[PDB]
């Protein structure tokens, strides 16, 4: 009556149509000229493709909204999503539903989803998209901004396409300290950044069983970390196998230091920076050489009683400044084939020498065969 | 208002708030209205996209153009967008799969035409010689890929890999190369040589390096400079005859370049070649602490 | 008039026509999937699990609601839906 009219004109007003371009659905209907079908049933519209002829009528209608007509078939749901006309369900993934239209979407707490599988689709209660499928192609799909806005922000950069080809996570391999939230002010303890981004590289124990556990550690992928601010940390950083460190420029002299690492422990009997070497126990396990004095000699070596765990690591003019007091600045141990360049030790605070923050050994190096210090300072 | 259609029905647009569905997203009219879009129609062949045409519109829209551009719609500091600082090429750009199992050859191949594209054969040396006055690319070896044919380096080439191998029992990092053919190189440098008919072929035989004399006569033209290496690590199946040719390569450097994979006791088994390096032809060529 | 009304809210949320209250005192809303404010003319998905018997107490003019089983906020709802 009245009532297929007013909702025609909710329809159109809806669509962007006219209301004499909405068609309700019934077997036998002429489906030519129409924008929008309505199902009385379901209650739900759809835009109809362009190209239906006049004399065309309609033969079924699917609860998924697949319509047969004398000329043929098309599947209104996977028109509608192609034109991002989208009802959104009651409820949510928490709360669960069912899914029965390609243009159907569902809630999930960190935007919505539409489901590119098997149609009808049930949603257990407390279920989220890992947990009923997945996400990608044939199953869960993202959509909308709000998924996009949480997709980026949890991503890997994989959704950004570069040149030639490929997208940025395919490009970005170099680490700094400010994806651990480093202050990097010089004055903030960023020790546990520090050691975290470490560790996200190679995270070896310092405790081990054997000769094979200890060795295993240096055929691990090797990583670039670039250090443009200036990071103040309180225990000696221990740097593991397969580690690049990188610096925009190498102090010379300088009297304020401003990119790199500052070394201020409470025990200044210690070393800033050492490399690992393992030492063997009584048991027969090994541990990783804590003792500032220690050094592991060619002896040492072939005794068993030490096994060195440095190599792969490449310096690039790094600076290291300590508070005045420091034992040692950097030891390194066991780096055979190891390489420097540029690597900056102390800085030129001013006349005093006894408040100069430089440490008063610098270097201390042994059981480095084929290692090249290139313009160390 | 989504207008009935799409663009591969064609439509007529009439106002700018109407949007016509592309297969990638909705797009407005920017330009002169009233604007009509025959069927079969793209945004790219009807006006393009950007402002005064085709102008993007809405989420759908937003994903595509994002993953398939260069980075122009991400702003950094302390100025410009992404795309103004991305030079490095990688091979996942390529979709390398990297675990030193999958013939990745095709891939690295690709990228490598992607920064100087150079014949196999050529007409003369003036044409030769062009190929060595283009823009060079840096390229980051970040996992381990496995080729099966002898990669070509051509001019304008900077690889990097974080660090260099050192008595490495397990390569992690580089290219490890797995031919049928044995009796071949790993990588080698472009080198010309002359035809009888006066053309130039790319030379591909392992034993040939060319002399100062070859170079004289130009029966030899090199094609090989503004090429440096810095940590390359190189392993190849136990047999292969040359790892590296280092020919023609004249003011090339080298710095870590790391060759051979200290596999185990057995040497007839162990992941290195024959010969290391062959080089000729490579004055003013440095190689810092090759291994 | 309510029933067109119901009619251009249930479309525009995509549900059926019945499945649209009203606001008023003491209203049931059980079963319901959107609620209509005829003061502020602005309609709200419900949050779902709202149980036959559970009856309207207010609506404020900052779209919190409260029934007979406790009280939801239409407007942080209806953000998470992107409802807006």
């Known amino acids: 009556s009245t009532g297929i009219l007013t909702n025609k004109q909710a329809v159109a007003r809806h669509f962007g149509v006219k209301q004499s371009e909405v068609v309700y659905f019934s077997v036998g209907v002429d489906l030519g000229g129409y924008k ?7 209650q739900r519209a759809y835009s109809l493709p362009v190209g239906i002829a006049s ?8 609860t998924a909204a697949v319509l047969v007509h004398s000329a043929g078939s098309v599947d209104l749901g996977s028109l509608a999503v192609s034109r991002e006309e989208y009802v959104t369900l009651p409820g949510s993934f928490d709360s669960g539903s069912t899914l029965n239209v390609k243009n159907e979407l569902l809630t999930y707490t960190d935007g919505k989803y539409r489901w590119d599988g098997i149609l009808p689709k049930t949603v257990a209660p407390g279920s989220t998209p890992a947990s009923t499928g997945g996400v990608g192609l044939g199953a869960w799909i993202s959509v909308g901004d709000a998924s996009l806005r949480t997709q980026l922000a949890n991503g890997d950069g994989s959704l950004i396409g ?3 080809q490929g997208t940025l996570n395919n490009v970005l391999t170099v680490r700094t300290p400010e994806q651990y939230n480093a202050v990097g002010d010089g004055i903030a303890d960023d020790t546990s ?5 470490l560790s996200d590289i190679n995270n070896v124990p310092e405790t081990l069983p054997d000769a094979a556990a200890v060795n295993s550690y ?3 992928v090797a990583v670039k970390i670039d250090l443009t601010k200036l990071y103040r940390f309180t225990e000696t950083l221990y740097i593991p196998p397969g580690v690049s460190i990188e610096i925009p420029t190498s102090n010379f002299f300088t009297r304020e230091c401003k990119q790199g690492l500052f070394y201020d422990p409470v025990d200044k009997n210690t070393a800033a920076i050492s490399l690992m070497v393992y030492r063997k126990q009584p048991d027969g396990s090994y541990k990783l050489n804590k003792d500032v004095d220690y050094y592991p000699t060619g002896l040492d070596i072939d005794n068993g009683d030490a096994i060195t765990c440095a190599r792969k690591i490449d310096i690039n003019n790094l600076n290291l400044i300590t508070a005045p007091g420091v034992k040692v600045g950097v030891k390194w141990i066991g780096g055979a084939g190891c390489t420097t360049k540029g690597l900056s030790i102390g800085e030129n605070t001013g006349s005093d020498i006894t408040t100069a923050r430089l440490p008063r050994v610098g270097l201390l190096q042994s059981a480095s065969w084929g290692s090249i210090h290139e313009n160390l300072r």
């Open 36 to 42: 929008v079908i309505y199902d009385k049933e379901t």
């Open 193 to 197: 950044k520090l050691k975290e981004m």
């Open 218 to 220: 240096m055929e691990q």
């Open 55 to 62: 004399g065309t009528t309609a033969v079924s209608l699917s």
């Open 162 to 164: 570069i040149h030639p």
